[PDB]
Coordinates of C-alpha atoms and ligand atoms in Angstrom, one line a residue:
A2 CA 100.8 156.5 92.5
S3 CA 99.0 154.9 95.4
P4 CA 97.2 156.3 98.5
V5 CA 99.0 153.7 100.7
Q6 CA 102.3 155.0 99.3
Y7 CA 101.3 158.5 100.2
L8 CA 100.4 157.3 103.7
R9 CA 103.8 155.7 104.0
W10 CA 105.5 158.8 102.7
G11 CA 103.9 161.1 105.3
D12 CA 100.6 162.4 103.8
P13 CA 97.6 161.0 105.7
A14 CA 95.0 162.3 103.3
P15 CA 94.5 160.3 100.0
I16 CA 94.0 156.9 101.8
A17 CA 91.7 158.7 104.3
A18 CA 89.5 160.0 101.4
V19 CA 89.5 156.5 99.9
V20 CA 88.3 155.0 103.2
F21 CA 85.7 157.8 103.5
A22 CA 84.4 157.1 100.0
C23 CA 84.3 153.3 100.5
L24 CA 82.4 153.6 103.8
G25 CA 80.0 156.0 102.0
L26 CA 79.4 153.6 99.2
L27 CA 78.8 150.7 101.6
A28 CA 76.3 152.8 103.6
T29 CA 74.5 153.9 100.4
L30 CA 74.2 150.3 99.2
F31 CA 73.0 149.3 102.6
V32 CA 70.3 152.0 102.7
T33 CA 69.3 151.3 99.1
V34 CA 68.9 147.5 99.7
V35 CA 66.9 148.2 102.8
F36 CA 64.6 150.6 101.0
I37 CA 64.1 148.2 98.1
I38 CA 63.5 145.1 100.3
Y39 CA 61.1 147.2 102.4
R40 CA 59.5 149.1 99.5
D41 CA 55.9 148.2 100.6
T42 CA 56.4 149.4 104.2
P43 CA 54.4 152.5 105.0
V44 CA 57.4 154.6 105.9
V45 CA 59.0 154.0 102.4
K46 CA 55.9 153.9 100.2
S47 CA 54.6 157.2 101.6
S48 CA 57.3 159.3 100.0
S49 CA 58.6 159.5 96.5
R50 CA 60.7 156.3 96.3
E51 CA 61.8 157.1 92.8
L52 CA 63.1 160.6 93.9
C53 CA 64.6 158.8 96.9
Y54 CA 66.5 156.5 94.4
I55 CA 67.6 159.6 92.5
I56 CA 69.0 161.1 95.8
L57 CA 70.7 157.9 96.6
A58 CA 72.3 157.8 93.2
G59 CA 73.5 161.4 93.8
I60 CA 75.0 160.4 97.1
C61 CA 76.7 157.4 95.4
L62 CA 78.1 159.6 92.7
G63 CA 79.4 162.1 95.2
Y64 CA 81.3 159.3 96.9
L65 CA 82.5 157.9 93.6
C66 CA 84.0 161.3 92.7
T67 CA 86.9 160.6 95.1
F68 CA 87.9 157.7 92.8
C69 CA 87.9 160.2 89.9
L70 CA 89.8 162.9 91.7
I71 CA 92.3 160.4 93.0
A72 CA 92.9 158.2 89.9
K73 CA 95.4 157.4 87.1
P74 CA 96.5 159.9 84.4
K75 CA 93.6 159.6 82.0
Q76 CA 91.4 162.0 80.1
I77 CA 88.0 160.3 80.7
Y78 CA 88.7 160.7 84.4
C79 CA 89.3 164.5 84.0
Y80 CA 85.9 164.5 82.3
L81 CA 84.1 162.4 84.9
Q82 CA 85.6 164.6 87.7
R83 CA 83.6 167.5 86.4
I84 CA 80.6 165.4 85.5
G85 CA 80.3 163.9 89.0
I86 CA 81.2 167.0 91.1
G87 CA 78.6 168.9 89.1
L88 CA 75.8 166.3 89.0
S89 CA 75.8 164.6 92.4
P90 CA 74.5 167.7 94.3
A91 CA 72.3 168.5 91.3
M92 CA 70.8 165.0 91.3
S93 CA 70.2 165.1 95.0
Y94 CA 68.8 168.6 95.3
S95 CA 66.6 168.6 92.1
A96 CA 64.6 165.6 93.5
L97 CA 64.7 167.3 97.0
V98 CA 63.3 170.6 95.6
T99 CA 60.6 168.7 93.7
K100 CA 59.6 167.0 96.9
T101 CA 59.7 170.2 99.0
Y102 CA 57.7 172.1 96.4
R103 CA 55.0 169.3 96.3
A104 CA 54.9 169.5 100.1
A105 CA 54.4 173.2 100.1
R106 CA 51.7 172.9 97.5
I107 CA 50.0 170.3 99.7
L108 CA 50.2 172.7 102.7
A109 CA 48.7 175.5 100.7
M110 CA 45.8 173.4 99.4
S111 CA 45.2 172.2 103.0
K112 CA 44.9 175.7 104.4
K113 CA 42.6 176.6 101.5
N114 CA 39.9 174.3 103.0
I115 CA 40.0 176.0 106.4
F116 CA 39.7 179.3 104.6
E117 CA 36.6 178.1 102.8
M118 CA 35.1 176.7 106.0
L119 CA 35.5 180.0 107.9
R120 CA 34.4 182.0 104.8
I121 CA 31.1 180.0 104.9
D122 CA 30.8 180.2 108.7
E123 CA 32.3 183.5 109.9
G124 CA 32.2 185.6 106.7
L125 CA 34.5 188.0 105.0
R126 CA 34.6 191.7 104.0
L127 CA 36.9 192.7 101.2
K128 CA 36.9 196.3 102.4
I129 CA 38.4 197.7 105.6
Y130 CA 36.0 197.7 108.6
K131 CA 36.2 198.0 112.4
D132 CA 35.6 195.2 114.9
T133 CA 33.2 195.3 117.8
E134 CA 36.2 196.4 120.0
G135 CA 36.7 199.4 117.6
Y136 CA 39.9 198.6 115.7
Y137 CA 40.6 198.5 112.0
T138 CA 40.0 195.1 110.5
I139 CA 39.7 193.6 107.0
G140 CA 38.9 190.1 105.7
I141 CA 38.0 187.3 108.1
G142 CA 38.7 189.2 111.3
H143 CA 42.3 190.2 110.6
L144 CA 43.5 193.1 112.8
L145 CA 45.4 195.7 110.8
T146 CA 46.5 198.1 113.6
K147 CA 45.5 199.0 117.1
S148 CA 46.1 202.6 116.2
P149 CA 43.1 204.8 115.4
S150 CA 44.2 206.0 111.9
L151 CA 42.5 204.7 108.7
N152 CA 45.6 205.8 106.8
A153 CA 47.8 203.8 109.2
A154 CA 45.5 200.8 108.6
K155 CA 45.8 201.2 104.9
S156 CA 49.6 201.5 105.3
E157 CA 49.9 198.3 107.2
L158 CA 47.5 196.6 104.7
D159 CA 49.6 197.7 101.7
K160 CA 52.7 196.6 103.6
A161 CA 51.2 193.1 104.3
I162 CA 49.7 192.6 100.8
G163 CA 52.4 194.2 98.6
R164 CA 50.2 196.5 96.4
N165 CA 48.3 199.7 96.5
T166 CA 45.2 198.2 98.0
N167 CA 43.4 201.4 98.8
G168 CA 41.4 199.5 101.5
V169 CA 40.2 196.7 99.1
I170 CA 41.6 193.2 98.8
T171 CA 40.6 190.0 96.9
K172 CA 39.6 186.6 98.1
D173 CA 43.1 185.1 97.5
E174 CA 44.6 188.1 99.4
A175 CA 42.1 187.5 102.2
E176 CA 43.2 183.9 102.2
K177 CA 46.8 185.0 102.5
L178 CA 45.8 187.2 105.5
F179 CA 43.8 184.3 107.0
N180 CA 46.8 181.8 106.8
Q181 CA 48.7 184.0 109.4
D182 CA 45.6 184.1 111.7
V183 CA 45.2 180.3 111.5
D184 CA 48.9 179.9 112.3
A185 CA 48.6 182.2 115.3
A186 CA 45.5 180.3 116.5
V187 CA 47.3 176.9 116.1
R188 CA 50.2 178.3 118.1
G189 CA 47.7 179.4 120.8
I190 CA 46.3 175.9 120.9
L191 CA 49.6 174.1 121.1
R192 CA 50.5 176.2 124.2
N193 CA 47.3 175.4 126.2
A194 CA 47.3 172.0 127.8
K195 CA 43.4 171.7 127.6
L196 CA 43.3 171.8 123.8
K197 CA 46.7 170.5 122.6
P198 CA 46.1 166.8 123.4
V199 CA 42.9 166.7 121.4
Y200 CA 44.5 168.8 118.6
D201 CA 47.4 166.4 118.2
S202 CA 45.2 163.3 118.3
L203 CA 43.0 164.3 115.4
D204 CA 42.9 164.4 111.6
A205 CA 43.1 167.5 109.5
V206 CA 39.3 168.0 109.1
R207 CA 38.6 167.8 112.9
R208 CA 41.6 170.0 113.5
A209 CA 39.9 172.5 111.2
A210 CA 36.6 172.1 113.1
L211 CA 38.4 172.8 116.4
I212 CA 40.1 175.8 114.8
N213 CA 36.6 177.1 113.8
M214 CA 35.4 176.6 117.4
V215 CA 38.4 178.5 118.7
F216 CA 37.7 181.3 116.2
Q217 CA 34.1 181.5 117.4
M218 CA 34.5 181.5 121.2
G219 CA 38.2 181.6 122.0
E220 CA 40.6 179.0 123.5
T221 CA 39.3 179.6 127.0
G222 CA 35.7 179.0 125.9
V223 CA 36.6 176.0 123.8
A224 CA 38.4 174.6 126.8
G225 CA 35.1 174.4 128.6
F226 CA 33.9 171.5 126.5
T227 CA 36.0 169.2 128.6
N228 CA 33.9 166.1 128.3
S229 CA 33.3 166.5 124.6
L230 CA 37.0 167.2 123.9
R231 CA 37.9 164.0 125.8
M232 CA 35.3 162.1 123.7
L233 CA 36.9 163.5 120.6
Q234 CA 40.3 162.5 121.9
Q235 CA 39.1 158.9 122.4
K236 CA 37.7 158.8 118.9
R237 CA 34.1 158.7 120.1
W238 CA 32.6 160.9 117.4
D239 CA 29.0 159.8 117.7
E240 CA 28.9 160.6 121.4
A241 CA 30.7 163.9 121.1
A242 CA 28.2 164.9 118.4
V243 CA 25.3 164.5 120.8
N244 CA 27.2 166.1 123.8
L245 CA 28.0 169.1 121.6
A246 CA 24.4 169.3 120.3
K247 CA 23.4 169.7 124.0
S248 CA 25.4 172.8 124.3
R249 CA 24.4 176.4 124.7
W250 CA 26.6 177.4 121.8
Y251 CA 24.6 175.0 119.6
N252 CA 21.4 176.8 120.8
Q253 CA 22.8 180.3 120.2
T254 CA 24.4 179.6 116.7
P255 CA 22.7 176.4 115.4
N256 CA 23.4 176.6 111.7
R257 CA 27.2 176.8 112.1
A258 CA 27.3 174.4 115.0
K259 CA 25.5 171.7 113.0
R260 CA 28.2 171.9 110.3
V261 CA 31.0 171.8 112.8
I262 CA 29.5 168.8 114.6
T263 CA 28.9 167.0 111.3
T264 CA 32.6 167.6 110.4
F265 CA 33.7 166.3 113.8
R266 CA 31.5 163.3 113.3
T267 CA 32.1 162.1 109.7
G268 CA 35.6 163.5 109.4
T269 CA 34.8 164.7 105.9
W270 CA 34.1 168.1 104.4
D271 CA 30.8 166.9 103.1
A272 CA 29.0 169.2 105.6
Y273 CA 30.2 172.3 103.8
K274 CA 30.9 172.9 100.1
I275 CA 34.7 172.6 99.7
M283 CA 50.6 166.9 91.6
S284 CA 51.2 163.7 89.7
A285 CA 54.0 161.2 90.1
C286 CA 55.6 160.8 86.7
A287 CA 55.7 164.6 86.5
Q288 CA 58.1 164.8 89.5
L289 CA 60.5 162.4 87.7
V290 CA 60.4 164.5 84.5
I291 CA 60.9 167.8 86.4
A292 CA 63.9 166.4 88.3
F293 CA 65.2 165.1 85.0
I294 CA 64.9 168.5 83.5
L295 CA 66.6 170.2 86.4
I296 CA 69.5 167.7 86.2
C297 CA 69.7 168.1 82.4
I298 CA 70.2 171.9 82.9
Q299 CA 73.2 171.2 85.0
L300 CA 74.4 168.6 82.5
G301 CA 74.1 171.2 79.7
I302 CA 76.1 173.6 81.8
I303 CA 78.8 171.0 82.2
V304 CA 78.8 170.2 78.4
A305 CA 79.0 173.9 77.6
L306 CA 82.0 174.2 79.8
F307 CA 83.5 171.1 78.2
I308 CA 83.2 172.8 74.9
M309 CA 84.4 176.2 76.1
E310 CA 87.2 174.9 78.3
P311 CA 88.2 171.3 77.2
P312 CA 89.4 169.1 80.1
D313 CA 93.1 168.4 80.0
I314 CA 95.9 167.2 82.4
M315 CA 97.8 170.3 83.5
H316 CA 101.2 168.8 84.2
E323 CA 101.1 162.2 91.5
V324 CA 98.2 160.3 93.1
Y325 CA 96.1 163.4 92.2
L326 CA 95.1 163.5 88.5
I327 CA 95.5 167.2 88.1
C328 CA 93.4 168.7 85.4
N329 CA 93.0 172.1 83.8
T330 CA 89.8 172.8 85.8
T331 CA 89.9 176.6 86.4
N332 CA 87.6 178.5 88.7
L333 CA 84.7 179.2 86.3
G334 CA 84.2 175.5 85.7
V335 CA 83.7 175.2 89.4
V336 CA 81.8 178.5 90.0
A337 CA 79.0 177.9 87.4
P338 CA 77.9 174.4 88.6
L339 CA 78.4 175.5 92.2
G340 CA 76.2 178.5 91.5
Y341 CA 73.4 176.4 90.0
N342 CA 73.6 173.9 92.9
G343 CA 73.5 176.7 95.4
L344 CA 70.4 178.1 93.7
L345 CA 68.9 174.6 94.0
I346 CA 69.9 174.5 97.7
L347 CA 68.3 177.9 98.3
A348 CA 65.0 176.9 96.8
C349 CA 65.2 173.6 98.7
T350 CA 65.8 175.5 102.0
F351 CA 62.9 177.9 101.3
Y352 CA 60.4 175.2 100.5
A353 CA 61.6 173.0 103.4
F354 CA 61.4 175.9 105.9
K355 CA 57.9 176.8 104.8
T356 CA 57.0 173.1 105.6
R357 CA 59.3 172.7 108.6
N358 CA 56.4 171.7 111.0
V359 CA 54.6 169.3 108.7
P360 CA 54.1 165.9 110.5
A361 CA 53.7 163.8 107.3
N362 CA 56.0 160.7 106.8
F363 CA 56.8 160.6 110.5
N364 CA 57.8 164.3 110.3
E365 CA 60.0 163.9 107.3
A366 CA 60.2 167.7 106.7
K367 CA 61.9 168.2 110.0
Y368 CA 65.0 166.1 108.9
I369 CA 64.8 167.6 105.4
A370 CA 64.9 171.2 106.9
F371 CA 67.8 170.4 109.2
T372 CA 69.7 168.8 106.3
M373 CA 69.1 171.9 104.2
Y374 CA 70.3 174.2 107.0
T375 CA 73.5 172.1 107.3
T376 CA 74.0 172.1 103.6
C377 CA 73.7 175.9 103.3
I378 CA 76.2 176.3 106.2
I379 CA 78.6 173.8 104.7
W380 CA 78.5 175.5 101.3
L381 CA 78.9 179.0 102.6
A382 CA 82.0 177.7 104.4
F383 CA 83.1 175.8 101.3
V384 CA 83.5 178.9 99.2
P385 CA 86.3 180.7 101.2
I386 CA 87.9 177.4 102.3
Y387 CA 88.2 175.9 98.8
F388 CA 89.0 179.1 97.0
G389 CA 91.6 180.2 99.5
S390 CA 93.3 176.7 99.6
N391 CA 96.5 175.3 98.2
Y392 CA 95.3 171.7 98.3
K393 CA 92.2 172.0 96.2
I394 CA 91.6 168.3 95.1
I395 CA 91.6 166.9 98.6
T396 CA 89.4 169.7 99.9
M397 CA 86.9 169.1 97.0
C398 CA 87.0 165.3 97.9
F399 CA 86.3 165.9 101.5
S400 CA 83.6 168.6 100.8
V401 CA 81.6 166.5 98.4
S402 CA 81.9 163.5 100.7
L403 CA 80.7 165.6 103.6
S404 CA 77.7 166.9 101.7
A405 CA 76.7 163.4 100.7
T406 CA 77.3 162.2 104.2
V407 CA 75.1 164.9 105.9
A408 CA 72.4 164.2 103.4
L409 CA 72.5 160.4 103.8
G410 CA 72.8 160.7 107.6
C411 CA 70.1 163.3 108.3
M412 CA 67.5 162.0 105.8
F413 CA 68.0 158.3 105.3
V414 CA 69.6 157.0 108.5
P415 CA 66.5 157.7 110.6
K416 CA 64.2 155.8 108.2
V417 CA 66.5 152.8 108.1
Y418 CA 66.6 152.9 111.9
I419 CA 62.8 152.9 112.0
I420 CA 62.6 150.0 109.6
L421 CA 65.4 147.7 111.0
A422 CA 64.8 148.5 114.7
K423 CA 61.2 149.7 115.2
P424 CA 59.1 147.4 113.0
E425 CA 56.0 148.1 115.1
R426 CA 56.1 151.9 114.5
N427 CA 56.1 151.3 110.7
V428 CA 52.3 151.8 110.5
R429 CA 50.2 154.5 108.9
Ligands
OLA1 C1 80.9 150.0 112.7 C2 81.8 149.2 111.7 C3 83.2 149.8 111.7 C4 83.2 151.2 111.1 C5 84.6 151.8 111.1 C6 85.5 151.1 110.1 C7 86.9 151.7 110.2 C8 87.7 151.4 108.9 C9 88.9 152.3 108.8 C10 90.0 152.1 107.9 C11 90.6 150.7 107.8 C12 92.1 150.8 107.7 C13 92.6 151.5 106.5 C14 93.6 150.7 105.7 C15 95.1 150.9 106.0 C16 95.9 150.7 104.8 C17 97.4 150.7 105.1 C18 98.0 149.4 104.7 O1 97.3 148.4 104.4 O2 99.3 149.2 104.6
OLA2 C1 79.0 150.4 91.8 C2 78.7 151.7 92.4 C3 78.2 151.6 93.8 C4 77.0 150.7 93.9 C5 76.4 150.7 95.3 C6 75.3 151.7 95.4 C7 74.0 151.1 94.8 C8 72.8 152.0 94.9 C9 73.1 153.2 94.0 C10 72.1 154.3 93.8 C11 70.7 154.0 94.2 C12 69.8 154.3 93.1 C13 70.1 153.3 91.9 C14 69.2 152.1 91.9 C15 67.8 152.5 92.3 C16 67.0 151.3 92.9 C17 67.0 150.2 91.9 C18 65.6 149.8 91.5 O1 64.6 150.2 92.2 O2 65.4 149.2 90.5
OLA3 C1 86.9 149.3 105.3 C2 86.9 150.2 104.1 C3 88.3 150.7 103.7 C4 89.3 149.5 103.6 C5 90.7 150.0 103.1 C6 90.6 150.5 101.7 C7 91.8 151.4 101.4 C8 92.8 150.8 100.5 C9 92.1 150.4 99.2 C10 92.7 150.8 97.9 C11 92.8 152.3 97.5 C12 93.1 152.4 96.0 C13 92.5 153.7 95.4 C14 92.8 153.9 93.9 C15 93.7 155.1 93.7 C16 95.0 154.7 93.2 C17 95.1 154.9 91.7 C18 96.2 156.0 91.4 O1 96.6 156.7 92.3 O2 96.6 156.2 90.2
OLA4 C1 69.0 161.2 86.4 C2 70.4 161.8 86.0 C3 71.3 160.8 85.4 C4 72.7 161.2 85.3 C5 73.7 160.0 85.3 C6 75.1 160.5 84.8 C7 75.0 161.5 83.7 C8 75.9 161.1 82.5 C9 75.3 161.8 81.3 C10 76.0 161.9 80.0 C11 77.4 162.4 80.0 C12 77.7 163.1 78.7 C13 78.8 164.1 78.8 C14 79.3 164.6 77.4 C15 80.4 163.7 77.0 C16 81.7 164.5 76.6 C17 81.6 165.0 75.2 C18 81.6 166.5 75.2 O1 80.9 167.2 76.0 O2 82.2 167.2 74.3

């Protein structure tokens, strides 16, 4: 009848879900108006604002589902229940997986440049060899094993590549091996206090130049260029260029040092030799249309109907929940994969950090939703609270920090 009547009767649940949904709707409208009024601010215009609007619409639909699950005895409401509870997480996570996939592609294309730089400078061997220390190595100085068995080296190489290599790889396989080495080198940099301040206060190209220097001499040797590192930190490229040209490393390996110094100076890859926007909308549209087609197919197979109360009970069985839940869970898994592969990306004021934390919480909440909902005797209220909680964790972990930066730190809103 009425949630207030159920509160007066002794059930403090329907009116609570209504208040939750109303607060969520008000918060979604607040965040949307903030992001529209401040569309040209660098914090908003740096991400996919259209995909952000798609995610906001998903959150709003997830909150509106409570008014469908707690409504009057009507048929269109039994339809809109399934539509909303299937499309809200779909609408959010399709845009989210598009964003995370584009971020992962950007990261791969960024590492490709360092691979090309150190292929030009250091070199590469597609067959297994031994380093000067006498240990099995292949590619751009990638250690296979410290053990003295060529068969063990080939075993670890096959285990790392995933194919019967027989001691021979390709350039892309060598790039895959080189990505782990550059990750380890960056970790070694961020742990030394004589290299981390410069590394964090640089752009990508100069970070790559410093990585090349570390690959050539080591972190302890690169830490010797104290004055030049401080010049680079203070964005004094023209002076650091000369001070590096005065070095003994420049006189021992001049050809590579010239390119590294020119890279440090100009900030471009000119010294060496080396995803659309409307496409993301269409991809998210297709991913949402797949879920909508699932929903329509279940409408045709199992037509909605009132079973037969403030709860509009419908004939929604378990399959009509399992299939959309399954597709949304696959979306969540892909989202989590691509957001974990990009967890340390600092773009958009470290947006991927909050994205990854939100994806972790969503995975946990859904893994808990399965046995809680399916082993429950109050399924409508649990569905209400679960959808509202997922929308809430999304809106709070992803959009609340941005609105906080906009409406409280207007000076940090700079590229
Ligand atoms: C920071 C701003 C405040 C945020 C918290 C707002 C809290 C709102 C909570 C619910 C309001 C009261 C619910 C209405 C009770 C209905 C019972 C009746 O009217 O008879
Ligand atoms: C009446 C339902 C609740 C209305 C409050 C929520 C309003 C925002 C809803 C979803 C955000 C995405 C929809 C609009 C996108 C931005 C509009 C635009 O840029 O033209
Ligand atoms: C501050 C935000 C919350 C303010 C209090 C809002 C709670 C009371 C509002 C009305 C709830 C009506 C919900 C509609 C469901 C009843 C329809 C039905 O049961 O058939
Ligand atoms: C970007 C995603 C936009 C999604 C917004 C909401 C989606 C609503 C889409 C159309 C609903 C049509 C459902 C079919 C009607 C019932 C008839 C039937 O299936 O037999």
